[PDB]
Design a binder for these strands. Structure first.
Lengths: 582, 264, 205, 124, 283, 283
DNA sequence: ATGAACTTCAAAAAAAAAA
C-alpha cells in the first residue's frame, strides 16, 4: 500500500490532465536553456528561473527522465538531450577537464545515435551539428548571462530550436515517440516477474529513478545498494521486483508532489499529501458537476493542509472524515528517503493528535476575548520567547514542541521552565502560557510522567486539593481583589510578588494575606468583598499548610490555577452564583 | 556446542545518562510514542556484549568481527573457520557472503527490544561548549560557543529478553564456555561500557531459564510473566533498585526448568 | 489446520521496497508466518503453507531510526569497523500487534521414511502448546520475538471487524523451487490482500 | 476543611484571630474598619502585642452581641482552639507565618456555615 | 599506563548558588521533576579539572584544551603537521595522530575529545568516564531575583527614568550531589593514561572547588572521595552494590538538610575487602 | 598581579532595615523558606564596593561603572575607539580590547562585566568571585508598614482630600550574614589584578557599610573579615573545612540574638597554620 | 574472483503566525 497508492493516484493525475510525465519523462527543474536554429549556431541562453526568494534551477520542464548515472565512469551513461553543463559544453567548474570532457564526448555519441535512429526532424539535426562544431559551444561560454550559470552548480542545459516558441527539442512530436519507445523497448528487456506495486507482468525495473525534494539531491525512494542491503542475492533493484510502468510512475509522482502545493512540513519533516480514491459521488451532487466528479489527486488535500496549517494558525475545527487522504511522511537522512508517517485513514483519524493537543490546550476564556478558542502555535510560543517569536530555541521549542503536538507525544519540561520564566518575568499570565502548562500536565498524567496529581479540566477546578493549584487560585483572587480596589493599578501585587509566589509560597503569601484585608476594606461594595473573602476561604480550605517551595510541576499548577480563577472571576455571573449557593 | 535452551529475562536500568537515544529527532531516548516507556534497542545490548568480549578476551577464538575503530585500535569450510575463530559469530550470528542459505548464520542468541517497565522521562539536558569545531557561520569575534544537547533519563528499568537455542549452537559452535562468557558479559558489561553520554548503567537480574530439553519445554510469554517487575508500594516514582519489586515466581518451573539467578 | 496466535510488542515485517528504511508491512507477512511455523518445527519432509491471517490488534506505526551496518562479512576483510560502515536505517515498527495465523503443511519430495502427516501435526501441536521451538519466532525481524500461543478456535478480540483498508500486493512467499539444497537463487511471487474484512486469506501456489 | 488537632502554633493563632474577627463582625453589621484592617498586619509576626488588646476587647465584643448564647459558643470554640496553644510566641517562623493565615481562613470558613459550630458545641 | 580499576564515589554539595544550570530551562539547575533531587552533569567537573590543570601546570605534553580562542580544526591541523604529515597511508595515520594527541593532550587522555573534523584522526574511547551527579534529599529552588542599575543595549523600554535590567539569579540552599564514575584500563593502555596522570586527576577532583568559582555558582565544596581500587582488569562484583554500600540518607528527625551536620554518610567497609582497596582523598 | 589565594570569611549583620531585598517577593529580604536564615546576594556588596570606590578615588585607570544613564553599548563603543579600532583582525582585537578595559576599569578587574553586546570584545572570567551570604540563626521578618500623607498620581488619589499612600517597609532585627568568597590567581594575572587593587578591595569591603546607607536598608555594619592568605597557586586543603573552622553559633541559653553580645564567634586557628596565613581587617 | 575505498552523480527547505 506504500507504493501502490502512488501508482493509483499517478494513474488518476495522468488521466485528469494535471500536467505530469507520459512514459519516460520527468518534470525536471532545468535552469538555463539553449536556443538554436535548424543547423546549430547558439543564439541566446535564456533562463526560466525568477520564482522564490531562493533562486531555484529554473522551471520544471517536461523533459525525458534521467537514466540515473552516478559512478566513476558516469560519462558513459549520459541522458537524452538534457543533462549537465559539463555534458553539453565540456566545461567543469569544480570537476576539471577529461572527467567532464568524456561526458560531452559520450553526450555527442548519444545525440548522434538518436539522430541516426530518428532522422528528418529539423530539431535533432540542429543539435547534432551544434555538438559537432567545437565553436558554437565555446560561444555559449561567452553569452550575456553565462556568468550566472557557472555560479549555481548543476546547471542543466536543454536545447530548444527556433520556430517553436516554448516547444523544446526533446518535446517535439517525433522525440516524444522516441521516448515512449525507449521505455517500451530497451526498458522492456530486463528481468521477468514479478511486480510488487502493480503485481502484474512487466519487466523488473533495475536502477530506480531519483526523487527530487528530499535530501541534498534527487535520490531514489526504493534504493537498495550495498553489500549487506541485498536480499536473497538479488544485488540492487531486484530485491524489490518493481516494474518500469510502476517505478517510473511513482518516481515521477514523488517528483511532482515534492515541487508543487502538496509539499508541506509537519514537524521538521517534509510530507507530501494527496487524496485517495474518492467516492463515486452521489447523484444530487454529481448532477451539478459536469464530467462528472473527476478523481483528482491534489483536490481535497486542502482540508488536511489547512489543518496542519491551522495548528500554526489557530483556525482548527473538529473535522468529519469519511474522505481518506494519503500522507507519505518522507524525511531526509543522508541521501535515503526515510518514511516517518503513513496513514491511509481520513482527516478525522489524522487529526486525532491535533484534537488531543487543542483539548489539552483548551483554557478558560471570557466574553469578547481577543484570543481565539484555539491559539496558533507561533502565537502560543510568543509567550515563551524574549519579546518577538524568533528567540526561541531551535531544538527543543520551535523544533520539538511542534513535533510533540502534531504526533500526540509527551511535552518536554522545557515548556514548563520557559512558561514559568516568562510568567514570573512578564509579571502576568496571558492566554498562551497557562494553556501550555495545562496541556503539559494533562499529557504527563496520560503518559505516566505525573502520579500524585490529576488531569485538569477546561473550567475552574474548585476541588483539586493540590498544594499548587489552590495557591494559584489564591494569587489570582488576591490580584483580582487588589484590582477591584485600585482601578488604575501600575505596580500591582502581581508584578512585585509573582516572582516568588510561584516558587516560595510562605514568603509571598505571608504578606499578601496581610495586604488582603486592607484591599477588602478599600472596596466600595462590601458585598463584593464578602463574596471574595468567602471564595478565598473556599480556595484555602483545600490547602492544609503553605509549603516551603513549589516544585516544577507545582509552579505549573500555580499558573494554571491562577488563570482559571482569574477567568472564573471575570465571568458574567459566576462568583455571585457560587457565593449564593452556600 | 551446548545442549539446553536458555530464555533469560535480562534486567538493566539507567541511573543518569542516555541509554539508547533516537536519531529520529537528534538523540532523545526512543520512548514509546503512546505510553511513554523507553524502548532501548537490543542492538545496543549486543554491541555492549561485543565490547565487553573485546575488552576481556583479546585473543583468538573469541574475536568480534563487528568491532569498533575507536574502542580497539569449501563453502562450509570458511563458515566453520569463522565460527571457530570468532565469538560474535557463534553468539548473535553471522553472514558469510559465500555461505549457504543466501549466506546466512542465524545464531542462537536472539535478543529483544528492551522496553522499560515504567514510562521514563526524557530529560532534555542541553549542555553548552566553550569551543566550536569548524569555522561556524556564527563564530564571529566574541566567544566561540556551540549549544549542545544530551538527553538524560532519571530512571528506567529496561526489560530485555533472550532466546538461546542449542539447535543453532550445534552449527555455530556456541559451547558452554561461550555461554558462560555471555553471562559474565551481561553481568559485568555495564561496568566497563561507560561514557559521558551513556552515564551510569548496571545489571539487575539475569534470570536465566535453563530448559532440560533441547526444544525448551516452556513458553516465552509464561517465562516472562513469571518475572514480575512492577513498582513498589509507597514509592510514587522509581529512582533506584529500592523502588522496584522484581518478585520472581519459581513455583511452577520446579519440574524441569532451572531459574538461574546469575545477576539478581 | 492450526490456529496459532502470534503476539508481540513490536514488529518489523520489512517491505521488500523499503529495506534501506525498514518500513514494516501493514500486517504480518505470509512468508514471515511460514518462517515462524518452520522455526517452531520444520524438517526436510514437512513443507509449511500459510492459509489465512487474522489480525487481532490495530495497526500502530512507530518510527525507530536504528543504526545498522551496510557491509557484509566474508573471508576477505577480517574486521568490519562500523565507524566506516554506519547505516542509519529507519524502522517504522508496528507497536502492539497480534495475529492468529491459520495454516497447515504438506510433504516435500525428500520426505524420507517418516512421512506421516499426523506425526508432524502432533509434534507441532505439542511444541506450540508446551512452548518448544527450533528457533524463537520473529515478527518480521529477529530483534522482536513472538509470544506465541496455540489457539483451538478464538481466544482474543479483533479490531478489524467491518470492511477496512486493502493493503495491495504484499510479499506472499519467495519462490525457492529453482533453488538447490540451502537456497541461493530465488524469485518473488506476490499476491493481493483481496479485502481485510476480518481475517485475510492467502492464495496457495 | 479544618484540622483542630494539628498541634501547630500558627494554626491555632490564625483560628483565634479568625474567631476574633468573626465576633467583631457579629457585634455590628455596619462595621467599616474591623480588626483585620489593622490588627492582622502584624498578627503573624508580633502576636504578643496584638492578641493582648484582642483578648482585652473580646469580652466587650461578646457583651455587644444581641444573643448571649452566641457569645458562649464563641468563647467555647475560642478555648477549644487555644487548647493546643500552650504559649503566645514572640515571632512566628515562615512555616508558622503561612500556617497563621491557613488556620485563619480555615476557621473563618468553618464559622461562616449553617450547622457546624453549633453541632460541634452540642457534643461538649 | 594504569592497571587497576577505580570506582570513586565523588560527593560534593553547594552552599548558595547555581551549580550545574540548565540552558534549556532559563537559569535553573537540573532537578528531578518527579521527585526533586538536584542533578549535576559531569562536564562541569571536567571543566573544573581542566581549569585546575591550566592554573597548576603550564607545560608541554599536557595540553589543557584552550577556551574561547581555540578552534578545534586549527588545533587538529597543527597536530597533523608533526610526524605523520602524509607519509603514513591515511588509515594508520589517523591512529598515529590519535596516539600523538593522547601523548600531548591531557583532556583527551583522561576524558576525550572529537578529532573527526576536517583532517580526521580517529576518536578516543576514553578511560575515565564520569557520570551525572544526583542528590538524595529533594532540593528546592530558591530563585534569588536581583536587579541592575545599568541598562545594556538600547532597550525599547529604557525610557527616561532608571535604566534598569533585573532578571533572575537562581540559588540552591543545599544538595549533596552523589556523583559516580568508573575508570577502565584497556583504553587507558592505548591512550597512555599513566599513574601520574591518575594522581593529577585525583588532585584536580579534590581541589577544583577551591579555585573554579563564580558569582552564579556561589560557594561549592567537595565532601568525600572514596575510590574503590581493584586488583585486576576483570570483574569481581557488580558496581551497583559497591556504590550502594556508601549510602547517604537523612540523620535524625529533620525535614531538610542545611550543612554537613544534617547528613549521616554511612560508610561500612565490610564486604568490599575481598580483592579491593579503599582510600580517602577528599573526606 | 597577585600570586596568593585569599579565602576571606566576610561577616556582616543588620540593625534595623531591609538589606538585600527580593524583587521576587514584594519588599522582603531573601530568607530561607525551610528554616528561616536570611540570605544576602553578593551583588549588593559589589555595588557597595563600587560606591565606595566612586566616592574615594575620582581618577583614571580605575573606572567605576557609572549609574543609570551609563549605556553599556556606548561605553563599549567608546573603549573600542582607542588603540584597536580595526587594525587588529577581530579575534585578537577582542582580547586586546578586553585587556584595555581591564587595565582601565576596576569593576571588571575585580569582578567582571558583560562586554559582548554590539561591538564584541570578549568576556572576563573574573578573579575575585564573592558568594551569596547566609545567616545562622533563623531570622524573623518584622514588616514595618508605614504611611504617607501625600498621594503620588492624581488617578489613585482618593475622591476626598485625605490623600494617603501607605504600603510596607520591611525591617530585620538581626542576622549575621556569614558571607563567603574565594580569590583566584590565574584570571588575576590576565586581568591585571595587582596587590594595590586587592588592598583597595579589602578597604572597600571593610568600610562600605559606613557610607552606602539608605532608609530601606537602615543601619548595617561589618563584623569581621578573616582572610585566609595561602602560599602558592595550588590546592592545599579543601576550603569547606577551612571555612568551617570559623563557626558562628549561639551563646548561652538564649532563643534569638539581638547584637554582638549574643553571638560567640569561635575562632580556633590551630590546624590552618600549615602553609596558610591569617589577618584581621574588620574584626 | 570480489569487498572496502574511491569517484562521480544535485548543488535543498522555508513558513510556522493570526480573529
Amino acid at each position: 500500500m506504500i507504493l501502490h497508492a502512488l501508482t493509483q493516484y499517478y494513474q488518476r493525475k495522468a488521466e485528469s490532465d494535471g500536467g505530469i510525465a507520459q512514459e519516460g519523462f520527468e518534470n525536471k527543474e532545468i535552469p538555463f536553456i539553449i536556443v538554436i536554429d535548424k543547423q546549430g549556431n547558439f543564439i541566446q541562453l535564456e533562463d526560466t528561473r525568477e520564482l522564490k526568494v531562493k533562486k531555484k534551477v529554473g522551471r520544471t520542464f517536461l523533459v525525458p527522465k534521467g537514466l540515473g548515472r552516478s559512478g566513476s565512469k558516469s560519462y558513459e551513461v549520459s541522458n537524452l538531450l538534457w543533462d549537465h553543463y559539463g555534458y553539453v559544453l565540456a566545461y567543469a567548474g569544480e570537476k576539471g577537464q577529461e572527467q567532464a570532457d568524456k561526458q560531452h564526448a559520450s553526450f555527442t555519441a548519444k545525440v548522434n545515435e538518436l539522430k541516426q535512429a530518428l532522422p528528418d526532424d529539423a530539431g535533432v539535426t540542429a543539435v547534432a551539428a551544434f555538438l559537432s562544431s567545437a565553436e558554437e559551444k565555446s560561444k555559449v561560454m561567452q553569452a550575456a548571462n553565462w556568468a550566472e550559470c557557472a555560479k549555481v552548480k548543476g546547471c542543466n542545459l536543454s536545447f530548444r530550436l527556433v520556430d517553436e516558441a516554448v516547444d523544446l527539442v526533446c518535446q517535439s512530436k517525433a522525440v516524444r515517440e522516441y521516448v515512449s519507445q525507449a521505455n517500451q523497448t530497451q526498458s522492456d528487456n530486463a528481468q521477468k516477474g514479478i511486480c510488487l506495486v502493480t503485481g502484474k507482468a512487466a519487466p523488473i525495473a533495475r536502477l530506480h529513478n531519483a526523487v527530487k525534494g528530499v535530501n541534498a539531491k534527487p535520490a531514489p525512494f526504493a534504493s537498495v545498494n550495498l553489500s549487506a542491503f541485498e536480499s536473497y542475492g538479488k544485488e540492487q533493484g531486484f530485491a524489490f521486483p518493481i516494474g518500469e510502468q510502476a517505478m517510473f510512475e511513482y518516481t515521477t509522482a514523488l517528483n511532482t508532489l515534492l515541487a508543487g502545493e502538496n509539499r508541506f512540513r509537519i514537524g521538521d519533516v517534509t510530507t507530501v499529501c494527496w487524496g485517495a480514491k474518492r467516492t463515486p459521488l452521489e447523484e444530487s451532487l454529481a448532477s451539478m458537476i459536469n464530467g462528472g466528479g473527476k478523481d483528482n489527486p491534489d483536490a481535497h488535500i486542502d482540508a488536511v493542509k489547512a489543518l496542519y496549517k491551522s495548528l500554526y494558525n489557530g483556525q482548527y475545527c473538529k473535522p468529519d472524515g469519511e474522505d481518506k487522504f494519503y500522507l507519505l511522511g518522507l524525511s531526509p537522512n543522508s541521501a535515503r528517503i526515510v518514511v516517518r508517517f503513513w496513514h491511509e485513514t481520513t482527516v478525522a483519524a489524522l487529526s486525532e493528535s491535533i484534537a488531543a493537543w487543542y483539548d489539552d490546550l483548551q483554557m478558560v476564556r471570557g466574553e469578547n476575548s481577543p484570543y481565539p478558542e484555539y491559539m496558533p502555535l507561533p502565537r502560543l510560543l510568543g509567550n515563551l520567547v524574549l519579546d518577538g517569536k524568533m528567540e526561541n530555541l531551535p531544538s527543543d521549542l520551535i523544533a520539538q514542541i511542534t513535533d510533540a503536538a502534531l504526533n500526540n507525544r509527551v511535552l518536554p519540561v522545557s515548556l514548563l521552565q520557559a512558561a514559568l520564566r516568562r510568567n514570573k518575568a512578564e509579571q502576568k499570565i496571558t492566554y498562551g502560557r497557562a494553556s501550555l502548562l495545562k496541556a503539559y500536565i494533562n499529557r504527563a498524567i496520560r503518559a505516566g510522567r505525573l502520579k500524585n496529581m490529576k488531569e485538569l479540566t477546561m473550567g475552574l477546578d474548585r476541588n483539586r486539593q493540590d498544594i499548587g493549584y489552590v495557591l494559584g487560585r489564591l494569587f489570582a483572587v488576591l490580584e483580582k481583589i487588589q484590582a477591584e480596589a485600585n482601578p488604575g493599578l501600575n505596580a500591582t501585587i502581581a508584578d512585585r510578588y509573582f516572582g516568588s509566589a510561584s516558587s516560595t509560597p510562605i514568603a509571598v503569601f505571608g504578606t499578601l494575606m496581610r495586604l488582603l484585608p486592607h484591599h477588602l476594606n478599600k472596596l466600595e461594595f462590601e458585598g463584593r468583598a464578602v463574596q471574595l473573602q468567602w471564595e478565598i476561604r473556599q480556595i484555602l480550605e483545600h490547602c492544609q499548610r503553605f509549603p516551603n517551595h513549589l516544585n516544577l510541576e507545582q509552579q505549573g499548577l500555580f499558573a494554571i490555577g491562577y488563570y482559571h480563577e482569574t477567568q472564573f472571576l471575570f465571568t458574567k455571573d459566576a462568583l455571585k452564583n457560587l457565593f449564593n449557593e452556600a | 556446542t551446548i545442549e539446553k535452551r536458555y530464555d533469560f529475562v535480562f534486567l538493566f536500568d539507567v541511573q543518569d545518562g542516555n541509554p539508547n537515544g533516537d536519531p529520529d529527532a537528534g538523540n532523545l531516548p526512543r520512548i514509546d510514542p503512546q505510553t511513554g516507556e523507553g524502548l532501548v534497542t537490543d542492538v545496543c545490548l549486543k554491541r555492549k556484549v561485543r565490547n565487553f568480549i573485546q575488552m576481556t578476551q583479546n585473543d583468538e577464538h573469541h574475536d568480534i568481527f563487528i568491532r569498533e575503530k575507536g574502542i580497539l585500535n569449501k563453502t562450509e569450510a570458511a563458515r566453520q573457520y569463522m565460527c571457530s575463530r570468532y565469538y560474535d559469530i557463534r553468539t548473535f550470528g553471522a553472514v558469510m557472503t559465500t555461505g549457504k542459505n543466501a549466506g546466512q548464520v542465524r545464531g542462537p542468541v536472539q535478543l529483544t527490544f528492551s522496553r522499560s517497565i515504567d514510562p521514563i522521562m526524557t530529560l532534555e539536558h542541553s549542555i553548552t561548549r566553550m569551543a566550536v569545531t569548524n569555522e561556524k557561520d556564527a563564530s564571529e569575534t566574541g566567544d566561540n560557543r556551540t549549544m549542545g544537547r544530551k538527553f538524560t533519563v532519571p530512571y528506567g528499568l529496561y526489560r530485555c529478553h533472550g532466546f538461546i537455542s542449542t539447535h543453532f549452537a550445534k552449527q555455530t559452535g556456541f559451547s558452554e564456555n561461550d555461554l558462560e562468557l555471555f553471562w559474565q558479559a551481561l553481568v559485568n558489561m555495564f561496568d566497563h561500557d561507560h561514557s559521558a553520554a551513556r552515564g551510569q548503567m548496571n545489571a539487575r537480574g539475569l534470570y536465566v531459564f535453563e530448559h532440560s530439553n533441547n526444544l525448551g519445554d516452556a513458553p516465552a510469554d509464561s517465562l516472562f510473566k513469571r518475572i514480575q517487575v512492577v513498582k513498589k508500594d509507597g514509592v510514587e516514582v522509581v529512582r533506584s533498585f529500592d523502588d522496584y519489586l522484581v518478585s520472581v515466581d519459581d513455583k511452577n518451573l520446579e519440574e524441569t526448568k532451572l531459574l538461574r539467578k546469575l545477576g539478581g | 489446520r492450526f490456529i496459532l496466535e502470534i503476539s508481540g510488542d513490536l514488529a518489523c515485517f520489512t517491505r521488500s521496497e523499503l529495506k534501506v528504511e525498514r518500513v514494516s508491512y501493514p500486517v504480518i507477512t505470509p512468508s514471515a508466518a511460514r518462517n515462524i511455523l518452520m522455526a517452531i518445527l520444520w524438517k526436510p519432509a514437512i513443507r509449511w503453507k500459510v492459509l489465512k491471517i487474522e489480525i487481532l490488534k490495530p495497526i500502530q506505526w512507530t518510527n525507530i531510526r536504528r543504526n545498522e551496518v551496510g557491509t557484509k562479512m566474508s573471508e576477505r576483510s577480517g574486521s568490519l569497523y562500523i565507524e566506516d560502515n554506519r547505516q542509519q536505517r529507519a524502522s517504522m515498527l508496528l507497536k502492539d500487534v497480534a495475529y492468529r495465523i491459520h495454516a497447515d503443511f504438506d510433504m516435500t519430495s525428500e520426505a524420507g521414511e517418516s512421512d506421516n502427516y499426523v506425526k508432524f501435526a502432533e509434534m507441532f501441536k505439542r511444541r506450540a502448546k508446551k512452548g518448544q521451538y527450533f528457533h524463537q519466532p520473529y515478527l518480521g525481524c529477529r530483534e522482536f520475538p513472538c509470544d506465541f500461543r496455540l489457539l483451538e478456535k478464538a481466544e482474543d478480540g479483533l479490531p478489524l471487524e467491518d470492511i477496512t483498508q486493502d493493503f495491495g500486493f504484499m510479499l506472499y512467499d519467495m519462490d525457492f523451487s529453482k533453488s538447490d539444497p540451502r537456497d541461493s537463487n530465488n524469485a518473488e511471487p506476490m499476491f493481493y490482500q483481496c479485502k481485510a474484512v476480518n481475517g485475510v486469506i492467502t492464495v496457495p501456489p | 476543611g479544618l484540622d483542630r488537632n494539628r498541634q501547630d502554633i500558627g494554626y491555632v493563632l490564625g483560628r483565634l484571630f479568625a474567631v476574633l474577627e468573626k465576633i467583631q463582625a457579629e457585634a455590628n453589621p455596619g462595621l467599616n474598619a474591623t480588626i483585620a484592617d489593622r490588627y492582622f498586619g502584624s498578627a503573624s509576626s508580633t502576636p504578643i502585642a496584638v492578641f493582648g488588646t484582642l483578648m482585652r476587647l473580646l469580652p466587650h465584643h461578646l457583651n455587644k452581641l444581641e444573643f448571649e448564647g452566641r457569645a458562649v459558643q464563641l468563647q467555647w470554640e475560642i478555648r477549644q482552639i487555644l487548647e493546643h496553644c500552650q504559649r503566645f510566641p514572640n515571632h512566628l517562623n515562615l512555616e508558622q507565618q503561612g500556617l497563621f493565615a491557613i488556620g485563619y481562613y480555615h476557621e473563618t470558613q468553618f464559622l461562616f456555615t449553617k450547622d457546624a459550630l453549633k453541632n460541634l458545641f452540642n457534643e461538649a
